[PDB]
């Protein structure tokens, strides 16, 4: 588990104030919430679908993002970067 | 068909610049929706299909000196 290493630098995802987003008319609401850490500290957060993938650029590197049905992310990223999701709230 | 949730990061540090680069997002062909992301708001997150990026980019990095592409995800229908 890498959820059980983030709360040993104190990460709570379930206490990360949101990330800023808008749910986009016409399509489906984004369920899943990610939030991007260097060195351990958040530089960004915003949304992703479940049981989907994103490619997204973190420094210089374009990495792909998978998100499973339950939101957990994995991907080759680049070294003192983590990413970490969990389900938006009611979703 | 297929549409795509594009992210776009820029130079906007204020309300007034965020609002320039909305308007000019809409405006673009095949933009369906435009909306501020990020922790600093410094990117606006579009969606659509047979959206010009390239162009739409380019009129960004004119207007705000810094525009790039950070984020692609394909819309999940359903």
Known sequence: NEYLDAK?????????????????????????????????????????????????????????????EGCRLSGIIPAGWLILGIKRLGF | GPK???????????????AQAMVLASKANGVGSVGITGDLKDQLEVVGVGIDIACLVRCLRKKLRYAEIVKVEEVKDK
């Open chain 1, 8 to 68: 040993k630098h104190g990460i709570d995802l379930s206490r990360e104030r949101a990330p800023n987003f808008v749910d986009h008319p016409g399509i489906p609401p984004s369920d899943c919430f990610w939030f991007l850490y260097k060195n351990y500290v958040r530089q960004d957060a915003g949304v992703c679908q479940s049981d989907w993938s994103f490619d997204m650029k973190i420094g210089q590197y374009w990495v792909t993002i998978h998100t499973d």
């Open chain 2, 4 to 18: 795509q949730k594009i992210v776009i990061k820029a130079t906007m540090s204020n309300a007034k610049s965020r």
